[PDB]
Design a protein around this motif. Structure first.
Motif, short mmCIF file in Angstrom:
data_model
loop_
_atom_site.label_atom_id
_atom_site.label_comp_id
_atom_site.label_asym_id
_atom_site.label_seq_id
_atom_site.Cartn_x
_atom_site.Cartn_y
_atom_site.Cartn_z
N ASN A 194 49.92 62.41 -44.34
CA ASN A 194 48.91 62.52 -45.39
C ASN A 194 49.40 63.21 -46.65
O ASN A 194 48.70 63.24 -47.66
CB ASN A 194 47.68 63.25 -44.85
N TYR A 218 46.66 60.23 -48.59
CA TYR A 218 46.95 59.01 -47.84
C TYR A 218 46.49 57.77 -48.61
O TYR A 218 47.20 56.76 -48.67
CB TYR A 218 46.29 59.05 -46.46
N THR A 219 45.29 57.85 -49.18
CA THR A 219 44.72 56.75 -49.94
C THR A 219 45.56 56.44 -51.18
O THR A 219 45.69 55.28 -51.58
CB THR A 219 43.27 57.06 -50.37
N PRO A 237 40.56 61.24 -35.73
CA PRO A 237 40.01 61.59 -37.05
C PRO A 237 39.03 62.75 -37.01
O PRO A 237 39.28 63.76 -36.36
CB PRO A 237 39.31 60.30 -37.47
N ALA A 256 33.63 59.27 -48.59
CA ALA A 256 34.47 60.12 -47.77
C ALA A 256 33.98 61.57 -47.78
O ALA A 256 33.90 62.21 -46.73
CB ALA A 256 35.92 60.06 -48.25
N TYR A 266 38.57 66.02 -47.36
CA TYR A 266 38.88 64.84 -48.15
C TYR A 266 40.19 65.02 -48.92
O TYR A 266 41.02 64.11 -48.97
CB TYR A 266 37.74 64.52 -49.13
N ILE A 312 36.78 53.58 -45.83
CA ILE A 312 36.81 54.86 -45.14
C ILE A 312 35.86 54.87 -43.94
O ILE A 312 36.01 55.68 -43.02
CB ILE A 312 36.47 56.03 -46.10
N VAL A 324 42.52 62.59 -46.77
CA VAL A 324 42.11 61.28 -47.27
C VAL A 324 42.70 60.95 -48.64
O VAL A 324 43.28 59.88 -48.83
CB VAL A 324 40.57 61.18 -47.36
N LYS A 325 42.57 61.88 -49.58
CA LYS A 325 42.97 61.65 -50.96
C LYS A 325 44.44 61.28 -51.10
O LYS A 325 44.79 60.35 -51.82
CB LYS A 325 42.66 62.89 -51.80
#
Ligand code: FAD
Ligand code: FAD
Ligand code: UDP
Ligand code: UDP
Lengths: 393, 393
Positions: free
Chosen positions: B281, B158-159, B100, B142, B151, B175, B155-156
Motif C-alpha cells: 500500500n 494503493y489506488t 481487509p 471509502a 483510507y 472500493i 486505500v489512497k
C-alpha cells in the motif's frame, strides 16, 4: 434362561457410544449403556439457549478435527459437517494477537514484518537455550519452538492459570498440541478434515445410540447397580470409561486432575468479541478464555440484539468433582503405572476393559477417543464376543 | 449447400466458452470460436513453471467465488474445487496488517484491542465527513466505510498505483468490492461458494471447449477473417467479447483502460512471504502486490528449496496493449453510452452481440461473467437460434 445383555458399557461419551454402536450393529448384540449424567454424550453435550436459540457447548467448546480417513468416514454416518475452520486469538496487554505461532504473531509482537527466512533466524536465536530433540518438559519444549520472549508472553501465564503447576513439571506433549508455523496460516489445528456437526452435537450422539439393541439408562451410577446387573449377564464384559483411579476407590492414591467451571451469560448486544474463542494470556484475569458461540455457526442466522458468551475457569479436581484434564506429572505417571497393573488384573478376573480419556488418564481428543474405541473393538472386543478369544494377550 | 457454422464466438474467455458450450450441448449447433492468443481461457490461462511444477496464473491471480447456486452447479460440471479460502495481507511501513476492514486491522493500526461495539464507534467518528448513502466517488465511499485515517494508509496509496487517477473521479463500486466487517473474519471475499480448480484453470477451460461441435482457432484475429467466414454462414450471429471501443475502430474516442505487467521470478528459497497474496500500500514501491503461487494449493506438496513469485505492475493501456481494467470515469461513462448505441445498432444490422468484461466495459469477475453469459443464452441466443426470435426487443 439365557443372558439379558451381551455387553455393559459405562459412560455415554464418544468412546462408549462408539463401542456400543459397533457391537450392536456389526455383531448383532444387546448392549446396555450406563450414564450417571441426566443426558448422553459426556462432555460433548450441547444445548440451545432459550433466549437466542444459539447452540451452547455445556462442558467447554468442542471442535472436531482428524487426519484419519477411516474415522472421518465413520463419524459421517451419523452427522454432516460444516466447513468451519477453528481459529484462536490471544489477548495480551490490551492487544489482540494472531495465534498460534506464525508470521502474524511474530510481526505483531516484535513490531515489524519478518520474512519466513528472517523469522526462522529470529526464533533460532531466542531458542538457543535448548534443542527441541532434548526437550523434557513443557517449559523447555515451548522455548525450543517459539523462543523465550514469546514463551513468557503467551505460554507461561496461560499455563499458570490452566494447570497451576510448575512448567518444568508438565509434559512436553501439552504444548506440541499447538502447531508451529512460519507462514501466515493461523488455523489452530493442522488436520486434514475439520468441522462442526451441522445439526449440533446432541443430534450426532443420539444417532449413534439410536439402534434398538442399545439401551441407555441415564442418572445411573455403575457402582450402584453392577451388583444387580452382572448376575443377569455373567458372560458379558464391561467397558469402563469413567475415572480410572475412582474405579479402585483411590486405593493406590489420587491422580492429579484439572476441572473446569463455566460462567454463561446472555448479553444485550449482538457481538461481544467478534470471534469464536479468545484466549486470555495475562494473569490479571481469572479466566483462561472466552467463548462466543454464535461465531461457531456463521451459516445460521441468529438474532443480532443478543449474544451468548462463556468464561472458562480452571482449578484442581477434588473428591466429587468431574475431572477434565489429566495433569500427568512424573509422580502422576508413576501412580498411573500402578493402576494400569490393577486394571490389567481386573481384565483377567472379571472381564473389565478400560478406555477413554478418563479411563486411561490420557489427554485425548474426540477423534483420538473414537479411533481408540475402533481399535479396541477390532482387536479385543470383536474377537471375544464373536470368536471366544480371551480379552488378554 | 447449407451453413458451415450456426454461431460465431470471438474470444475464448469464460464468457465466450460458456456461450459456446451452452449452444453446442443444449441446442445441438456447430460453434466456431476465434481466439487470437496462442492459447484458450483468456486471462484465466494457467501454466506450470518447469523448475518447480507450481501452477502459475499468467495474467494475474484468479480466485473463483460466487453466491449464485446455479452458476456454482454449472461450473462443477467441468472441474472440481478445493476448499481454499482467499486471504490478503497488507504491507504498510514495514509492517504486515490483517486485511481487509475488521477487528484485526483496527487493533493493529490503532495499537490496542477494540470490541465490536467500540470499533463501530471509532469508525463512525472518523467517517463523520460523509454518509455512505450520499457517496458519489471512491474516495468519499471509502472514508464513509473505514474512516479517513485508514483510507490514507491502505486505500489512497494503493489506488494511486493501481489507477493513477484522482480518487474523486473513480466509481464508488470499486472500493465496495472489499468487505467491511466488525469481526475478526479476514476472508477477502464474502460469497457462499469459493475455491480453486483442483486440476488447474487450463484443464477447466479445456473441458468446456471439449465438445466436438465446438471448433477453436487459435492465433486468429476476428477482424482478419470475418470477411471470409461470415459468407460461409450468413444466418449465424456473432458473440463479440473483445474490447468494445476497438470494434468500432475507436471512432467515437478511446475508453480509459488499465493494463498490467508481471515479473515472474523463481527464487532459491522455499518461502518468500508465507502467504498467497501480499498487497503493498506504500508509494515507495512500484508494484501493487506480490503473488506466491505455492500458497494457492497447500494440498499439493511442492519442493521446499524453490518457489515462484510474481510482482504486479499497473499502467495505462495504450494502442496495442491488452486491456485489463475499465477505469469508468464520468467521461468514460459518457463515451460508453455512445458505443452502446453503436453496439445496439450493430445488433440490428448484422446480428452482432456484445458481452463480457471487455465487450461491455465492466469490472466483472469470473462468476459475474459466466452468469452474464447464461442470461444472454437463456433470453437472447436460445430463442433466436431455436425459435427464430429476433435478437433485439
Ligand atoms: C474443555 C474441553 C474442550 C475440548 N475440546 C475438544 C475439541 O475441540 N476437539 C476434540 O476433538 N476434543 C476436545 N476435547 C476432548 C474430548 O471432549 C474427549 O475426547 C471426549 O470427552 C472423549 O470421550 P470419552 O468418553 O473418552 O470421555 P467423556 O466423554 O468425558 O466420557 C465419560 C463419561 O462417563 C460417565 N461416567 C463416568 N463415571 C461414571 C460412572 N461411575 N457411572 C456412570 N457413568 C459414568 C460420565 O458421565 C462421563 O460423561 C475437549 C475436552 C475438554 C475438557
Ligand atoms: C489481474 C486480474 C485478476 C482477477 N482475479 C479474479 C478473481 O480472483 N476471481 C474472479 O472471479 N475474477 C477475477 N478476475 C476477473 C476475470 O478474469 C474476468 O471476469 C474474466 O476475464 C472474464 O472473461 P471475459 O471472457 O468476459 O474476458 P477475457 O476472458 O479477458 O476474454 C477476452 C478474450 O477475447 C480475446 N479477444 C479479444 N479480441 C479479440 C479479437 N479481435 N479476435 C480474437 N480474439 C479476441 C482475447 O484473447 C481475450 O482472451 C481478475 C481479472 C484480472 C485482470
Ligand atoms: O494460548 C495458549 C494456548 C495454549 N497454551 C498451552 O498449550 C496447552 C494446550 O492448549 P490447548 O488449546 O490445545 O488446550 P485445550 O484446548 O485442550 O484446553 C495448554 O494446556 C497450555 O499449556 C498456552 O500456553 N497458551
Ligand atoms: O489494499 C487495497 C486493496 C484494494 N483497494 C482498492 O479496492 C479496489 C478493488 O480491489 P481488488 O483487490 O478487488 O481489485 P482487483 O483484485 O480486481 O485487482 C482497488 O482498485 C483499489 O482501489 C485498495 O485501495 N487497497
Amino acid at each position: 434362561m439365557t443372558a439379558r445383555f451381551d455387553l455393559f458399557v459405562v459412560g455415554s461419551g464418544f468412546f462408549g457410544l462408539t463401542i456400543a454402536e459397533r457391537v450392536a450393529t456389526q455383531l448383532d448384540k444387546r448392549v446396555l449403556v450406563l450414564e450417571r449424567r441426566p443426558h448422553i454424550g459426556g462432555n460433548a453435550y450441547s444445548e440451545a439457549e432459550p433466549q437466542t436459540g444459539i447452540e451452547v457447548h455445556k462442558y467447554g467448546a468442542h471442535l472436531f478435527h482428524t487426519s484419519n480417513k477411516r474415522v472421518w468416514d465413520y463419524v459421517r454416518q451419523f452427522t454432516d459437517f460444516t466447513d468451519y475452520r477453528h481459529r484462536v486469538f490471544a489477548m495480551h496487554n490490551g492487544q489482540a494477537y494472531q495465534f498460534p505461532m506464525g508470521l502474524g504473531l511474530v510481526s505483531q509482537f516484535f513490531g515489524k514484518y519478518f520474512t519466513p527466512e528472517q523469522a526462522r533466524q529470529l526464533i533460532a536465536e531466542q531458542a538457543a537455550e535448548i534443542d527441541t530433540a532434548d526437550a523434557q518438559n513443557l517449559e523447555e519444549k515451548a522455548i525450543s519452538l517459539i523462543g523465550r520472549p514469546l514463551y513468557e508472553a503467551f505460554v507461561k501465564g496461560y499455563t499458570a492459570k490452566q494447570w497451576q503447576t510448575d512448567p518444568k513439571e508438565l509434559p512436553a506433549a501439552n504444548i506440541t498440541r499447538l502447531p508451529v508455523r512460519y507462514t501466515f496460516d493461523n488455523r489452530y489445528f493442522s488436520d486434514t478434515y475439520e468441522g462442526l456437526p451441522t445439526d449440533g452435537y446432541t443430534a450426532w450422539l443420539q444417532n449413534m445410540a439410536a439402534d434398538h439393541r442399545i439401551e441407555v439408562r441415564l442418572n445411573t451410577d455403575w457402582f450402584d447397580v453392577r451388583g444387580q446387573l452382572r448376575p443377569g449377564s455373567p458372560a458379558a464384559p464391561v467397558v469402563y470409561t469413567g475415572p480410572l483411579d475412582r474405579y479402585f476407590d483411590y486405593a493406590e492414591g489420587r491422580l492429579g486432575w484439572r476441572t473446569l467451571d463455566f460462567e454463561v451469560e446472555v448479553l444485550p448486544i449482538g457481538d461481544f468479541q467478534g470471534t469464536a474463542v479468545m484466549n486470555y494470556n495475562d494473569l490479571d484475569v481469572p479466566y483462561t478464555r472466552i467463548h462466543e458461540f454464535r461465531h461457531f455457526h456463521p451459516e445460521r442466522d441468529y438474532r443480532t440484539d443478543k449474544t451468548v458468551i462463556m468464561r472458562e475457569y480452571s482449578r484442581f479436581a477434588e473428591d466429587d468433582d468431574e475431572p477434565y484434564y489429566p495433569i500427568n506429572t512424573e509422580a502422576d505417571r508413576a501412580l498411573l503405572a500402578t493402576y494400569r497393573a490393577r486394571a490389567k488384573s481386573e481384565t483377567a478376573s472379571s472381564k473389565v476393559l478400560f478406555g477413554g480419556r478418563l479411563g486411561t488418564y490420557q489427554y485425548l481428543d474426540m477423534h483420538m477417543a473414537i479411533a481408540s474405541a475402533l481399535n479396541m473393538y477390532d482387536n479385543v472386543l470383536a474377537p471375544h464376543l464373536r470368536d471366544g478369544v480371551p480379552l488378554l494377550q
